[PDB]
Every structure is written in structure tokens, then in C-alpha cells.
Amino acid sequence: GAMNSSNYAELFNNDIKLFVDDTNVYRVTVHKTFEGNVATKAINGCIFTLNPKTGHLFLKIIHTSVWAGQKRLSQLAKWKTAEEVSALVRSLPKEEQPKQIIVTRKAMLDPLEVHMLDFPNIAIRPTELRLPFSAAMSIDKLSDVVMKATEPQMVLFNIYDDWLDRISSYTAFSRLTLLLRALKTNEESAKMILLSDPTITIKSYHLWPSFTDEQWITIESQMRDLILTEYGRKYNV
Amino acid sequence: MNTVPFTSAPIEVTIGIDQYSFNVKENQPFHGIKDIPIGHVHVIHFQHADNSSMRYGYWFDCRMGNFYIQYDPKDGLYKMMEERDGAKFENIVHNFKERQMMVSYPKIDEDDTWYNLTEFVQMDKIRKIVRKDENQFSYVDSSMTTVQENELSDPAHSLNYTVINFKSREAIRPGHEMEDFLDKSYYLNTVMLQGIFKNSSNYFGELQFAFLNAMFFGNYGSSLQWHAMIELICSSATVPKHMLDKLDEILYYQIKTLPEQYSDILLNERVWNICLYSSFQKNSLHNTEKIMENKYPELL
Numbered sequence: 111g112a113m114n115s116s117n118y119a120e121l122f123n124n125d126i127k128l129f130v131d132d133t134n135v136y137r138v139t140v141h142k143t144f145e146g147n148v149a150t151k152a153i154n155g156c157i158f159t160l161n162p163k164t165g166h167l168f169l170k171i172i173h174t175s176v177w178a179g180q181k182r183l184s185q186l187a188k189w190k191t192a193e194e195v196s197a198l199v200r201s202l203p204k205e206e207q208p209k210q211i212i213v214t215r216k217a218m219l220d221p222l223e224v225h226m227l228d229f230p231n232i233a234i235r236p237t238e239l240r241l242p243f244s245a246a247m248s249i250d251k252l253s254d255v256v257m258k259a260t261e262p263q264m265v266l267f268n269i270y271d272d273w274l275d276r277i278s279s280y281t282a283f284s285r286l287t288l289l290l291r292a293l294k295t296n297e298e299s300a301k302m303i304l305l306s307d308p309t310i311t312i313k314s315y316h317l318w319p320s321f322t323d324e325q326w327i328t329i330e331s332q333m334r335d336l337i338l339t340e341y342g343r344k345y346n347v
Numbered sequence: 348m349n350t351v352p353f354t355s356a357p358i359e360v361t362i363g364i365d366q367y368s369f370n371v372k373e374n375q376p377f378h379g380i381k382d383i384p385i386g387h388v389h390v391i392h393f394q395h396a397d398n399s400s401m402r403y404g405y406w407f408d409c410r411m412g413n414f415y416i417q418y419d420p421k422d423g424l425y426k427m428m429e430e431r432d433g434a435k436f437e438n439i440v441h442n443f444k445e446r447q448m449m450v451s452y453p454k455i456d457e458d459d460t461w462y463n464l465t466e467f468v469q470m471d472k473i474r475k476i477v478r479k480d481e482n483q484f485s486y487v488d489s490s491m492t493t494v495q496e497n498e499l500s501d502p503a504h505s506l507n508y509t510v511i512n513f514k515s516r517e518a519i520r521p522g523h524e525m526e527d528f529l530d531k532s533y534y535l536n537t538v539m540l541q542g543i544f545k546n547s548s549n550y551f552g553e554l555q556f557a558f559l560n561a562m563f564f565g566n567y568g569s570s571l572q573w574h575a576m577i578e579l580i581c582s583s584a585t586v587p588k589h590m591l592d593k594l595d596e597i598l599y600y601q602i603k604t605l606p607e608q609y610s611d612i613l614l615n616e617r618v619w620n621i622c623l624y625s626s627f628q629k630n631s632l633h634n635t636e637k638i639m640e641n642k643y644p645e646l647l
């Protein structure tokens with residue numbers, strides 16, 4: 111069954127599970143041709159596959175070469191996503207394979223179910239949450255490795271940095287979704303907010319700045335303001 | 348011209364023979380059905396006047412034996428039986444014919460409806476879907492579930508239709524996931540036609556039998572089977588040309604014959620709209636699409 115507000119805490123139990131977001135798999139720029147027609151140019155994309163309990167991110171970079179000579183690319187992108195997710199699961203030891211895979215968009219259900227026929231005991235689930243994982247390309251270090259790639263490549267990150275040393279996975283996931291929601295609503299503001307003070311450096315092995323507990327509380331508050339504001343600026347309230 | 352004679356009619360009942368039907372009153376002097384066309388399967392079916400629940404009936408081929416209908420007051424239904432003494436059966440049939448206590452199978456000579464609905468239906472194939480090998484005829488009713496329904500509970504009373512499942516390893520070759528799921532030609536032509544059914548006639552026979560059970564008994568598992576076998580063809584990009592033309596005729600006569608008032612339960616909106624308007628074969632079923640649009644434009 112679908113994942114929603116009411117069964118939210120299941121995300122942080124001890125059953126291995128992965129979120130899969132395909133928004134950024136097939137990415138294009140739209141442009142005018144010399145004749146004045148419109149055309150697309152693909153750019154590198156990525157599959158966002160995230161263990162919400164541990165923070166482990168399996169970032170499969172989707173190189174533009176995979177679209178060469180293919181038709182119906184938005185449809186293909188969903189099947190390619192499912193192919194790569196299935197390959198990832200098959201690559202893991204049995205005790206590390208997920209018990210559930212939650213897809214952020216319903217159109218991934220049939221592609222993933224069909225690619226996972228060999229794994230009848232892995233449940234494929236949709237969600238009623240409007241999660242902001244599309245904004246993962248607003249994280250500078252993620253966007254950079256995607257755009258620099260010259261061939262297909264898997265990169266492993268912990269999207270929580272070292273937060274689980276100090277907070278729970280429920281709290282870590284809530285912080286992540288707040289940050290990403292903010293970046294999706296107003297990327298410029300959100301990013302300014304991270305760098306208001308610049309002494310709080312990002313470690314080389316991290317994605318986000320090294321805030322103290324007290325500085326995170328301030329940051330988190332400022333992202334909630336941003337989101338409310340933009341919600342006013344947008345809806346006029 | 349063959350005869351299914353009846354011992355008596357002790358309870359009020361609506362009796363069907365193929366697409367015809369008539370009302371028999373409690374203890375009315377009814378002793379069966381004569382002039383039944385040889386060369387086709389037939390179905391004789393029943394709905395008690397007191398319990399319109401449970402439609403039930405018997406598929407049979409008079410070439411395979413002499414059959415009679417007798418009411419059982421213990422089990423409370425009309426039972427088909429075989430008389431192995433041919434003299435005794437012909438003599439009982441001649442007595443009833445002379446006293447004019449039989450209805451005549453009321454076929455109009457111009458009318459090919461029953462032929463068109465049963466063109467590919469064979470008694471020997473029916474007896475493999477409905478397993479009861481000690482009889483030459485086959486019982487079906489409204490409540491019998493299919494093998495595939497049982498998987499998702501008494502298997503002796505199951506409809507053993509061929510399992511079709513579009514999200515199954517049988518349907519999807521490793522490495523052709525997207526290809527095989529969006530274009531089911533492999534599954535239709537190699538797995539089902541060449542592998543399980545052997546030829547298109549046997550496929551069409553099971554399709555036609557499933558439809559008839561859905562229409563005459565309201566058997567839900569049979570309706571599911573009928574639609575799945577349509578959908579498998581319509582979702583295949585590569586179908587023998589003779590099969591597409593024959594499918595259009597088959598479906599035309601099924602839609603023509605369906606009671607106008609039962610279309611809401613027996614016709615699956617998604618499958619028909621997919622098949623007539625989205626699928627690879629969207630332009631290949633001209634007769635079916637014209638009768639569907641003129642008779643059930645609401646469903647579409």
C-alpha cells in the first residue's frame with residue numbers, strides 16, 4: 111500500500127528500504143534551431159536512490175550516450191531507471207537488499223515491478239507524499255559529479271553527512287526534506303541562507319556545512335520562513 | 348436433429364438452450380428440447396424462479412452420447428445424465444415427440460448467431476477447462492472460480508483456464524523487460540500460440556468459451572479471462588493477419604449478442620478503450636469498433 115503521513119515512521123524502522131526518484135534521469139535544454147524550429151539537447155542526469163534510515167545515497171549517473179538513437183525518451187527513462195535499480199539490488203548481498211522500494215512517482219511502478227520479477231518478496235510501493243527529491247541537483251557537489259561525468263558511473267554519498275552521530279534518522283530525514291523543499295521553492299534564497307555566516311565550512315567529505323546543533327536550529331527556522339514567504343509571494347498572502 | 352429429453356419439471360425454472368430461453372411452471376408437463384442442431388456444442392442452463400441466485404448449466408455435444416435432464420430433489424437442481432441404453436432413450440424420446448411435450452430449438456434459418464459464437468469451441472477442450480472426466484458433458488455455474496483466481500479454494504470445481512499474467516516471468520523475457528511489456532507479441536505468438544495453445548483456433552475456442560460462461564452464468568472469472576485474451580492480442584504489435592480479421596468477427600458477434608442491460612458489469616472500460624483506441628490493433632477491428640460505438644458509446 112501507499113506511503114503517506116499516517117505510516118511515515120515505517121521509514122525509520124529496521125526493515126531495509128530505498129526511495130527511488132527518477133525526476134532527474136532524463137534532463138534536456140530546449141533551444142531554437144537555425145531554421146527557427148525547436149530542439150532538445152540532453153544533459154547528464156541521475157537516479158536518486160536513498161536509504162532514509164542510514165542516509166546512504168546510491169547516485170547512478172545517467173550519461174547522455176544512453177539516449178543515443180533512442181525514441182520516446184521520457185518513457186525509456188522510466189525503464190532505464192528500473193533497469194539500474196534492479197541491477198543495484200542484484201549487486202548487493204542478500205542481507206543488504208531492500209525489503210521495500212518506494213517510488214516517488216507512480217509512473218515508475220510498472221517499470222520497476224517488471225524489472226524486479228526475480229525478487230517477488232521486495233515490495234514496490236508508491237507514496238502520497240510530495241517529496242522534494244528533484245532538488246537534489248541543487249546540492250552543488252551532486253550537480254558537479256553528474257555534469258562532469260564522461261561515462262556511466264555510480265557515486266556513493268551519505269546525504270546526512272555525520273548527522274546521525276547526534277540526531278535520529280527521523281530528525282535527519284526531516285532536516286533533509288526541509289532543506290530540499292527550500293531549495294526547490296527558491297534556490298537562490300535557500301543557498302544564501304546556508305552561507306549567511308561563511309566560517310561554517312563544508313568538509314571535503316560532506317555535502318552540507320558543519321553547523322552546531324544550535325546553528326542548525328537557526329538554519330531550520332530560516333528555511334521555514336523562506337517557504338512560508340515564497341508561499342505568500344507566490345499566492346499573495 | 349437431436350433431443351435432450353427431460354424426466355419432468357418439478358420446480359418452476361427459466362430454462363435456456365444456447366441463446367434461447369423459456370419459462371417452465373412448477374410441475375408443468377415439459378419433457379425437453381428437440382431439433383437441436385448437430386455439429387456445434389450447446390449449453391442448457393437454468394435459473395430457478397425462487398432463487399435467481401445460481402445460474403447453472405451443462406455444456407454438451409449430442410454427438411458424444413444420449414443425454415437427459417432430471418431434477419434431483421436432494422441436491423435441489425436439474426442434473427444432466429447419460430442414458431447408455433440407446434433403445435430406451437430413443438423410445439422415451441419418441442413417446443415425448445408423439446405427445447408433443449417438447450419445445451423445438453427455435454433457430455431461424457438465416458441466423459448464424461450460434462455458429463458464430465461457438466466457431467472454435469470444442470467439447471474436448473471444454474472438458475479440460477472443466478475437469479470431471481467421468482461425464483461427457485460439463486457443469487458450469489455463476490460461482491465457480493478460476494485456477495488463477497484460486498492462486499490469488501476447492502480445485503475440483505475450478506475453471507482451468509489458461510493463466511495469462513502480463514507482469515510475470517512467463518510474459519517477460521530477461522533483458523527484454525520494456526520491449527515485452529509494451530509489445531506483447533513474444534508472449535502471444537511464442538509462449539501462448541506456439542507453446543500452450545498450439546494454434547489460433549484453440550486460443551479462439553477458449554476465448555469464446557470464456558465469453559459464453561460470462562454471458563450465460565455471470566461468471567466473473569470467465570469475464571476476466573475473456574478480456575485478458577482480447578487484451579493480449581490487441582497489445583501485440585505483430586499478429587497474423589488472419590487472426591486479426593477473425594478476432595474482429597468473433598468480438599462483433601459477442602457484442603451483438605450481449606444483453607443491452609448487462610453491458611455495465613460484463614464489459615471492462617479500460618480494456619475496450621485500450622483495445623479500440625490506444626492499442627497496436629486500434630485500426631484492425633472495424634466491425635467491432637462500429638458496433639461498440641453504436642451500441643455502447645457510454646462505455647467509451
Ligand SMILES: CC(=O)NCCc1cn2cccc(C)c2n1
Binds near residue numbers: 436439
Ligand atoms: C426409466 C427411468 O429410470 N426413468 C426415470 C428417470 C429417467 C431416465 N431417463 C432416461 C432417458 C430419458 C429420460 C427423460 C429419462 N428419465
